[PDB]
Design a protein around this ligand. Structure first.
Ligand SMILES: *[C@@H]1O[C@H](CO)[C@@H](O)[C@H](O)[C@H]1NC(C)=O
Length: 167
């Protein structure tokens, strides 16, 4: 199940956001670099903070990510399936991918069992809906942009290392 924008009380995007070419062959994991969360109520708060941060501080039109995965094993909708994320700050990457952002800092600490499980369910749901190509790669944002320090999670990316679609 998905906590939708209207369920976590998302601000509207400060401007219109371009649509994404579907289906997408690349799915990109990123750390949110905020505190993590165990329940839906605290996760709701986290997501609202990141939207506010992304708009006020980072100067994006909206929360950067397509989806956010909380430590409670829930999926929080940022821009969603059909809008273009701003995760890589690079039009070439962002126009050909989806971002799954993991609520937390994961240089050392691991994502929870639930964070990993729902990732699988989410990738599956995306293939069924025709948002993700069956031949997709799931990969690390630090691999795509090695000099960007905001993408280094490392303990997050190790958890996916031996998944089949992982690169
Ligand atoms: C969140 O991170 C803390 C470390 O600050 C850890 O002890 C805790 O178990 C984590 N909780 C979840 C659900 O990820």
């Amino acid at each position: 199940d998905f906590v939708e924008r209207q369920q976590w009380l998302a601000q509207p995007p400060q401007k219109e956001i371009p649509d994404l070419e579907l289906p997408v062959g690349l799915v990109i994991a990123l750390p949110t670099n905020s505190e993590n969360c165990s329940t839906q109520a605290i996760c709701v708060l986290r997501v609202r903070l990141l939207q506010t941060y992304d708009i006020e501080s980072s100067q994006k039109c909206d929360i950067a990510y397509n989806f956010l995965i909380g430590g409670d094993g829930n999926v929080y909708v940022g821009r969603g399936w059909n809008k273009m994320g701003a995760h890589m700050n690079n039009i070439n990457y962002d126009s050909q991918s989806l971002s799954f952002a993991y609520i937390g800092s994961f240089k050392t600490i691991q994502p929870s069992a639930k964070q990993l499980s729902v990732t699988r369910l989410l990738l599956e749901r995306g293939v069924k809906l025709g948002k993700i190509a069956p031949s997709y790669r799931f990969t690390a944002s630090s691999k795509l942009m090695p000099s960007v320090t905001d993408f280094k999670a490392d303990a997050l990316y190790a958890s996916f290392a031996n998944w089949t679609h992982w690169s």
